[PDB]
Amino acid sequence: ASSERELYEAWVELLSWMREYAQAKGVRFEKEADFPDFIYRMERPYDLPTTIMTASLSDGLGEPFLLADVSPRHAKLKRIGLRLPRAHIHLHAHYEPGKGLVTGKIPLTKERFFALADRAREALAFA
Amino acid sequence: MVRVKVNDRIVEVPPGTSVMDAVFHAGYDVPLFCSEKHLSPIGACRMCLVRIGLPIQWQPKLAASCVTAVADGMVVDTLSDVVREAQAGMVEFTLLNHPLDCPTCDKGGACELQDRTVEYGLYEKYPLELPVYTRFEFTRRHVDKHHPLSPFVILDRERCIHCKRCVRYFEEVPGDEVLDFIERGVHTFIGTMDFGLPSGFSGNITDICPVGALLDLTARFRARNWEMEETPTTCALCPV
Amino acid sequence: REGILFTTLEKLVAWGRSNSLWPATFGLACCAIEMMASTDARNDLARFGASPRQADVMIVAGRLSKKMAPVMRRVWEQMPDPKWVISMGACASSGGMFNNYAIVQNVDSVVPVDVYVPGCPPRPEALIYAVMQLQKKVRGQAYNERGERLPPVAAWKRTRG
Amino acid sequence: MRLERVLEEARAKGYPIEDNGLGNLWVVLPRERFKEEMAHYKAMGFNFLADIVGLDYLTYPDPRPERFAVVYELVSLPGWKDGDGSRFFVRVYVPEEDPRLPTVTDLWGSANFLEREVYDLFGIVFEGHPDLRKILTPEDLEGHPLRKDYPLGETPTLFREGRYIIPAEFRAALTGKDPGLTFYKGGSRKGYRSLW
Amino acid sequence: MTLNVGPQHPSTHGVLRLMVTLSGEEVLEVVPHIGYLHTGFEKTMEHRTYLQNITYTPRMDYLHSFAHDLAYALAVEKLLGAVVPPRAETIRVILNELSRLASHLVFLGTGLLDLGALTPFFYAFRERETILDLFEWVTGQRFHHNYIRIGGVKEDLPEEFVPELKKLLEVLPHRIDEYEALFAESPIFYERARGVGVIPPEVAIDLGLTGGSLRASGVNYDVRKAYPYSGYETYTFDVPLGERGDVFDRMLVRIREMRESVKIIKQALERLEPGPVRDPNPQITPPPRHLLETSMEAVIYHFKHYTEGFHPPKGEVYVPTESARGELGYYIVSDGGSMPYRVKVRAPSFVNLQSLPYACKGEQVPDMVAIIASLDPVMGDVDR
Amino acid sequence: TLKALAQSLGITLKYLFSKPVTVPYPDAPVALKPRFHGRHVLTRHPNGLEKCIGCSLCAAACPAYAIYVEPAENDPENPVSAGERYAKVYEINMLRCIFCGLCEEACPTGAIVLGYDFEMADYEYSDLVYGKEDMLVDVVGTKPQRREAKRTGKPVKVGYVVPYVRPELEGFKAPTEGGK
Amino acid sequence: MVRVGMRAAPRVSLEALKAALGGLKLSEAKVYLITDWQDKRDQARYALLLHTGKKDLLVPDAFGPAFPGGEEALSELVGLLLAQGARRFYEAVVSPGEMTALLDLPPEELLKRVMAIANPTDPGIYL
Ligand code: SF4
Ligand code: SF4
Ligand code: SF4
Ligand code: SF4
Ligand code: SF4
Ligand code: FES
């Protein structure tokens, strides 16, 4: 559906949350990758709310403890995922209309994410 | 010497020969990622796959020519419709999760992936049919990108095709396992818990990498491979 | 007397020349055919002579072969003095797309260039721009990128010899 | 029909026959039989002499019999007396250390300028020519430009602050004997052909 | 009097140098001297991609350039075994013939001026301008258009090209006739050109004068007919001819060629329906620009194609084509490299010239000018 | 054939009394076709981000070798282009340039795209090697044009008009048609 | 081929050249000026290769305004070629990087490269 659009908007949202946890703890955030379908989009039109495909939270050493990504505008079975490096931890965010952003049947709130990020920093982050 | 015939031509070739080398020795060719000069072949990237006969008696499944020994009076097929189809296939599996960086990639003009892909890839299916480059229409593997491993060495985990070349190298040649794969399946990636990239030999992996995963930081973003004037010389820094 | 030394008189003659600028074409390649278009639209210029003797402006239009250089040399020398050189197109101006044994890699080697006109071939209206350049150049109305005012005649600046 | 009479003649006398499936055909005569055989060729009804094309194979990846090879193009005009439309190449290899070859000037006056060009650009001297004068390359040019051992003669293309490009050090494109930028080249980049 | 008609002066056209061995008002023998335009493509092009060369192909015969484009494109396609789409082929015949009308328009413009007088250069120039506007419309360039591709052609035709080709296809029949009107009934020209310029067919054949200055002396050979290529095999096609080769007949033959060319333009214009425009084989043709933002294979192939280019099989190849100056064709030796091993260009204008010491032998001096213009050389093709 | 002299004159007469043909550049602006090959332009995305990711494939595509691109790494805080890479130097020697547009055609991001300007004739060789900051979509004029327009303070008028600008030039403002 | 002079030292090189030419008549000689950079003669350096036809002579890059009092040296050089009746002057353009390597090559090779790249030039620009 046009759920796609609300998904990209929500993706922008999640990025915002990453940036915040980043400043809060004095621990590095990084924009990893932009959209090929924007970069290599030439004259072609681009309506997406941002141009950004991949991001992360890195420790002092720059090794990431948290990773986050959204599907390109043109891919089938669109998802946004989360991955914890080294920990074999994979999470899949969908979007149910009216409810909000969900992992399967479980609502994904900002809070849930901040807790996951702190556990991540304290466990995984080397410095 | 052991008598081998590759495609339309015949070669003398010493007994312990890799089928790949008997191939190339006959003046032919075959995709090559995991295996490396001075490195253990392990049929890993599975690029070098060819056909072998031993009497006309063809073996059932394909030999990785890199990890196959050669036997006396042996036949090797590299141009068959089925072989080229298979080669194209492995190439497509490799290209399956890749990042899309060529214009912006430092591995630039000379990438074993780029060149192997353009050599052997997209086998001819049968007119001016309008064909598709890409079948897979799902989301790619996205990981950590542009990560400095040492003041001299940079890491893109997305580009890595999981040949064994760098880790293999570290254990075999210098003997410092400061690099190895981490998780498994498609999730697998290069990382280190020895942070400096300690070895005084660390920069060679930059040369070995068939792709741009491992690049040379001192020369990052300077010019494209073709664009340099390249001056072959000898290093006067020490007596070797 | 070269058009000089009364503020009224020199300006007067200098217009005379700029607006009179009398092209003597020196065709070489496809560029010459792109100047034969310029012949159509033209209105201080396109009467010729054609004979070199009779003209101020030399238009080098085309690839100038190395064997061809000493020729163009004398044609330029065999022009009356208050004379200007326009260099037309890439082959003339620099070595162009033919970078090699055959062709002069800048015509400025053999004849003093006044004005350069890029393109392969340049549109004719660009050559009008160049003769307006050279028009306004000999009026002493012309400047480079460094801030400097440009002399009416280049080849008032080379040592002949 | 006059072409068949050429091939049938070449097979008996042991003349090798080259063929590409593009529709182009060659006949290589030895040096000896060349002058006379080709005299016989004009005599055979060959109106028109199209080309003399000089070839320097020095840098060609595979070896050939001799370094330079010349190809003449003989034809019989289709709209003339009885024209087949029979056109074909006759190739003659020539030694590096012996750039000799008889002119067909007597036969065709076409042979006049073309053989001179092949003299200018390659060192090849054509016997019996009315006038072998240098044709194309500047009077005081030394040597023979289009033979491979002779520099293309590039000059750097020029930019702003100490910035240059040396084309031959800039070139992305590879020749036949070029390795390429990886460990080797296979496949399409060792040569490719689509199958119709 | 060995009179020395110089390199560029006095109006010996296109930078030729002529040693007219001449006592009196006749002409003994002209000893021709060329080489003044020698750019050295055959070497330069050994240093360019097969794609890169397509920028160097139009540049030799700059009047009928697309005949270069066509010949080279074809010889390579053949050599690498590529399949050219029908609409591309049709467009290539249209452009070839339109470029021919351009070239011819030029030839007779200069001819009429060269001896005789000034006026009709301008009308030919007007029609040529409509043609050049057509070329600019489709290729973005006046000439040297980088359009034809080894697959096919660079991109498709815009909306506005069709309407404008018709306009000129409408005026031209009346128009070509107007040029003809002045000429065929030649007032002075008849007593100027009819006698001068002797061409025996046998010597034309002996010296190898192929280029449509051949049919003016009564030999019937056209490459579009004798050795058909781009589907000229399939057109309603008239080949004009001359009686005894003089200046006059050559001169009118090409004018007839212009209406027949226009008839080919109309004919091909009729047969044109929507489709794709170049051979999709990625080895041959760089990927579609839109999917550079999606496919891995796309990006790889884009990068590779525009840097290295492609490698045709080891082989030699040649294909013959018809320009407005005669037999044209590229002899391409490929070594399986990204750049041709060697490209020798069969230059029609170069072989056509062996018959000028013959042609203007015994002719007048004022006529020795006219007899040159009548032979229609282009020096870029000659020196080269 | 005596009659011809007469008819010859006649047609010319017809043509004298027919007045019209020609365009008086620069006083009347030349009409250009939309695909014409002009002064190179670098283009930007809606974001304002430059299309140029500085990959120098325009330069590799170049038969005249007229394009020099020194590459560079994007600054996370304040970015230039959409990748991690952009063009630190873009020089084009107009004098070296043959005007194919193989650069544009090679260009992966639709960065390098030939423009509409032809009034670039200039007095000095090295003034003719254009840099990036002479080529961006925002710029209106050629070098001598702009320089005259500053030393005069009289604004630039280009001597051309087009029916419209191509999709690939998006952002490039030009005098068009009666669109204005 | 002989090689005289040394890089970047105008007056010594000029005095030595004056010594070496002698009563040699130059009417059939060809004079090649080797330089980097077509446009800017103001900061230019110049090396010279003289092909007399009966023997060749190399001078490194010691000439031009690039070095102090160098301009007057190049000017007197060309003047002196002109006096002995040299006529045919040529200009050769090399990369700056080339210039050192070029003159360390063997005589024959260097000379063929020079004749291949050299552009006919007006002697007057060096006066
Ligand atoms: S690793 Fe090779 S294929 Fe991948 S982006 Fe870099 S150059 Fe392209
Ligand atoms: S980083 Fe490179 S060398 Fe190491 S396994 Fe990955 S692809 Fe092979
Ligand atoms: S600049 Fe272009 S149009 Fe002019 S002579 Fe050179 S190739 Fe021909
Ligand atoms: S138009 Fe052609 S010559 Fe000019 S920069 Fe582009 S590729 Fe090079
Ligand atoms: S203009 Fe295009 S081709 Fe050139 S460097 Fe920029 S993105 Fe790459
Ligand atoms: S090359 Fe043999 S499997 Fe990697």
From Swiss-Prot, chain B:
Residues 82-121 form the 4Fe-4S His(Cys)3-ligated-type domain. [4Fe-4S] cluster 1 binds at residues 98, 102, 105, 111. [2Fe-2S] cluster binds at residues 34, 45, 48, 66. Transmembrane segments: none annotated. [4Fe-4S] cluster 2 binds at residues 160, 163, 166, 209. [4Fe-4S] cluster 3 binds at residues 235, 238. Signal peptide: none annotated. NDH-1 is composed of 15 different subunits, Nqo1 to Nqo15. The complex has a L-shaped structure, with the hydrophobic arm (subunits Nqo7, Nqo8 and Nqo10 to Nqo14) embedded in the membrane and the hydrophilic peripheral arm (subunits Nqo1 to Nqo6, Nqo9 and Nqo15) protruding into the bacterial cytoplasm. The hydrophilic domain contains all the redox centers. Belongs to the complex I 75 kDa subunit family. This is NADH-quinone oxidoreductase subunit 3. It comes from Thermus thermophilus (strain ATCC 27634 / DSM 579 / HB8). The gene is nqo3. The chain holds residues 1 to 261 of 783 of the full protein.
From Swiss-Prot, chain D:
This is NADH-quinone oxidoreductase subunit 5. HAMAP family: NDH1_NuoC. Disulfide bonds: none annotated. Keywords: Cell membrane, Membrane, NAD, Quinone, Translocase, Transport. PROSITE patterns: COMPLEX1_30K. Belongs to the complex I 30 kDa subunit family. Its EC number is 7.1.1.-. Its main location: membrane.
From Swiss-Prot, chain E:
Gene3D superfamilies: Cytochrome-c3 Hydrogenase, chain B (1.10.645.10). The keyword Plastid does not apply. Keywords: Cell membrane, Membrane, NAD, Quinone, Translocase, Transport. InterPro entries: NADH_Q_OxRdtase_suD (IPR001135), NADH_UbQ_OxRdtase_49kDa_CS (IPR014029), NDH1_su_D/H (IPR022885), NiFe-Hase_large (IPR029014). GO terms for cellular component: plasma membrane. It is a peripheral membrane protein. One of its GO terms (molecular function) is NAD binding. Its EC number is 7.1.1.-. Signal peptide: none annotated. It catalyses: a quinone + NADH + 5 H(+)(in) = a quinol + NAD(+) + 4 H(+)(out). PROSITE patterns: COMPLEX1_49K. It comes from the Bacteria. It is found in: Cell membrane. It is an enzyme of class 7 (translocase). The keyword Membrane applies. NDH-1 shuttles electrons from NADH, via FMN and iron-sulfur (Fe-S) centers, to quinones in the respiratory chain. The immediate electron acceptor for the enzyme in this species is menaquinone. Couples the redox reaction to proton translocation (for every two electrons transferred, four hydrogen ions are translocated across the cytoplasmic membrane), and thus conserves the redox energy in a proton gradient required for the synthesis of ATP. The Nqo4 subunit may contain the quinone-binding site. Belongs to the complex I 49 kDa subunit family. This is NADH-quinone oxidoreductase subunit 4.
UniProtKB/Swiss-Prot annotation, chain F:
Keywords: 4Fe-4S, Cell membrane, Iron, Iron-sulfur, Membrane, Metal-binding, NAD, Quinone, Repeat, Translocase. Binds 2 [4Fe-4S] clusters per subunit. The [4Fe-4S] clusters are referred to as N6a and N6b. Its cofactor is [4Fe-4S] cluster. One of its GO terms (biological process) is aerobic respiration. It is found in: Cell membrane. It catalyses: a quinone + NADH + 5 H(+)(in) = a quinol + NAD(+) + 4 H(+)(out). [4Fe-4S] cluster 2 binds at residues 62, 97-98, 100, 103. InterPro entries: 4Fe4S_Fe-S-bd (IPR017896), 4Fe4S_Fe_S_CS (IPR017900), NADH_quinone_OxRdtase_chainI (IPR010226). The keyword Lipid metabolism does not apply. The keyword NAD applies. It is a peripheral membrane protein. It comes from the Bacteria. It is an enzyme of class 7 (translocase). Residues 42-72, 88-117 form the 4Fe-4S ferredoxin-type domain. [4Fe-4S] cluster 1 binds at residues 52, 55-56, 58, 107. This is NADH-quinone oxidoreductase subunit 9. It comes from Thermus thermophilus (strain ATCC 27634 / DSM 579 / HB8). The gene is nqo9.
